[PDB]
Amino acid sequence: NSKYITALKRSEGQLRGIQKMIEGDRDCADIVTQLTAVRSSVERVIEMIITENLTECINQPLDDSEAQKERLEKAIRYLIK
Amino acid sequence: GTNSKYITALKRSEGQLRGIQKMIEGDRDCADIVTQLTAVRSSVERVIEMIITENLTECINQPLDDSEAQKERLEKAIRYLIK
Amino acid sequence: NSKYITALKRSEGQLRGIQKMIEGDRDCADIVTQLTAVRSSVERVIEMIITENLTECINQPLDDSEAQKERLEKAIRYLIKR
Amino acid sequence: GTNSKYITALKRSEGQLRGIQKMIEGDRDCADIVTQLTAVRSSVERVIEMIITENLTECINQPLDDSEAQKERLEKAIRYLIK
Amino acid sequence: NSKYITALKRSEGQLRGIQKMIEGDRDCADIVTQLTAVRSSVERVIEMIITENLTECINQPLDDSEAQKERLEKAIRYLIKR
Amino acid sequence: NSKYITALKRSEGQLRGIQKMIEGDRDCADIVTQLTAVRSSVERVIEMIITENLTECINQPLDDSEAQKERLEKAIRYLIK
Ligand SMILES: [Cl-]
Ligand SMILES: [Cl-]
Ligand SMILES: [Cl-]
Ligand SMILES: [Cl-]
Ligand SMILES: [Cl-]
Ligand SMILES: [Cl-]
Ligand SMILES: [Cl-]
Ligand SMILES: [Cl-]
Ligand SMILES: [Cl-]
Ligand SMILES: [Cl-]
């Protein structure tokens, strides 16, 4: 949905800002702090997509038993990777 | 040189974020969206690790001549590695 | 669960146990090992709770499909954290 | 089919362990030795995750008809995922 | 360090704090959050100790090169754990 | 050194045993327990090699400053990967 796109757009804005921080010779801690914030915000989108995908696989199973087996397995594999 | 390498990587990553944005607007494939999101996450983490690694390295390789300054400097460098 | 409250007593007592050793200038390797054990015992309570909550969520779903979806999402989100 | 897939992977891994053994006896390259050790570790972890994933999947997809049995079964399946 | 002993008091008190809530059949989401905070506060003491020990190991090496090697190895091994 | 080879040989023995466990239709928990033990023993060799390598880079630096910089960085990168 459209909540991810806002969050991705922000991360993208922060990434170009961090570019300006390196190209202006800012220090290790200021740069790492911002990069970590970008990293967590991307990870949070990843987690939300994985969570929603696994929820829908559990909550709305396919008719075919083997198909539903393979679909849950793929959803869970993302959870533990 | 070091710093240009970082900026190339970060510009790749922000480019991939825009691509991923277009995917989600299209209700495009969910397994693909996670794969490329993970690729962005990994490349950002790569830059983080390189910066922390270089910082710690030059703490060890180029110690400060004030001993208390050097203790505090190394502690911060190691804590960045820990976190 | 008095399951958890006995485990939280062990850990809490282990913490003041550790605290004597730091007061003691005592063996640094021991102190870390003992702190790590406290950390793990707390974590296993955390994992037991979130496991139970997701189990109840899967086995006893809400009546309303949308409510159950939001409920599953939150239960799953507690898994992918540490 | 499932089980043959696992055995192929595990036999690859034990083969790579013997290769790594020969490397260390030769005082061979340390960066290579870690890379391939990590590859073995990853492939073993892949088998672990597949087994835990399938176990959890068939807990959900094929629930037990005793309700208390099914609660205990699912709890163990999720705890394997957690650990 | 009385640095650590104040932190270990907060955590230990937070644990019996949590324990009231489990006795309370209290909000499950809160309980996990509060346990996670205890887990993190213990971990940060762990990381502070191992960071200090490796710092002292790098800055104040032993006289004997082999002894220093074994000493560095053990200090580094405490990093790569969780 | 030769302590790694003993440990690797054991892991290799356990891996073929786990093969016999699957090919004899043993259950999820027994198989996972053994595979986890193999995984930790491999990881422990990895950690020991990384630890020793980083120790020697710190304890026995190269003469050249840039060379020593790149060598420590590679050693530390393995530590945090
Ligand atoms: Cl994260
Ligand atoms: Cl943010
Ligand atoms: Cl690289
Ligand atoms: Cl991380
Ligand atoms: Cl101490
Ligand atoms: Cl696969
Ligand atoms: Cl793991
Ligand atoms: Cl509870
Ligand atoms: Cl491990
Ligand atoms: Cl073993």
3 state SS of B64: coil
Chain C hits for D71, Cβ within 8 Å: 55, 59
Ligand sitting nearest the alpha carbon of E23: 8
Rounded Cα gap, residues C61 and C68, in angstroms: 6
CA distance F22 to D11: 12
Nearest-angstrom CA–CA distance, F7 and F38: 10
Tokens of E26: 């209290």
HSE-up of residue D45 (Cα within 13 Å, Cβ side): 16
Q: Amino acid identity of B72?
A: E
Q: Give just the sign of the alpha carbon dihedral F81, A28, B73, E50.
A: negative
CB contact under 8 A, B51 and A29: no
φ, ψ of residue C30 to 5 degrees: the values are -60, -45
* A24 secondary structure, DSSP code: T
Of A26, D43, F37, C22, residue with least CA distance to E9: C22
- The approach used to solve this structure was X-ray
> How many Å from the N-terminal Cα to the C-terminal Cα in chain D?
27
Token pair for B19: 């691509």
Nearest to E43 by CA among A29, B79, D81: B79
Say if the Cβ atoms of E58 and F58 lie within 8 Å: yes
Domain around E57? 1-82
Distance of CA F76 to the CA centre of its chain: 16
Q: Enter the tokens of residue D18.
A: 């013997």
DSSP state of A27: -
CB F75 within 8 Å of CB B61: no
Contact B81 F79 (CB under 8 A): yes
The C-alpha atoms of residue C31 and residue C42 are separated, in whole angstroms, by 17
Q: How many folded domains does chain B comprise?
A: 1
The whole-angstrom distance between A64's CA and the closest CA on chain C is 20
What are the Cα distances from residue C59, in Å, to C3, D60, D73, E22? Answer: 21, 8, 11, 22
**Which amino acid makes up residue D74?**
L
Chain A residue with minimum CA distance to D61: A69
**Which of C47, C5, C7 minimizes the C-alpha distance to E23?**
C5
Judged by DSSP in three states, E25 sits in coil
CB A51 within 8 A of CB C73: yes
With both helix axes pointing from N to C terminus, report the angle between E2-23 and E28-59 in degrees, rounded to the nearest 10: 160
Contact call for residues D21 and F22 (beta carbons, < 8 A): no
Distance CA F26, CA F13 (A): 18
**F51 → closest Cβ in E65, E68, E73:** E73
Burial class from Cβ neighbours inside 10 Å (0-12, 13-18, 19+) for residue A34 reads middle
Tell me if chain A has a CB within 8 Å of the CB of C77.
Answer: yes
In this structure, are residues A78 and D49 in contact, taking their beta carbons and an 8 Å threshold? no
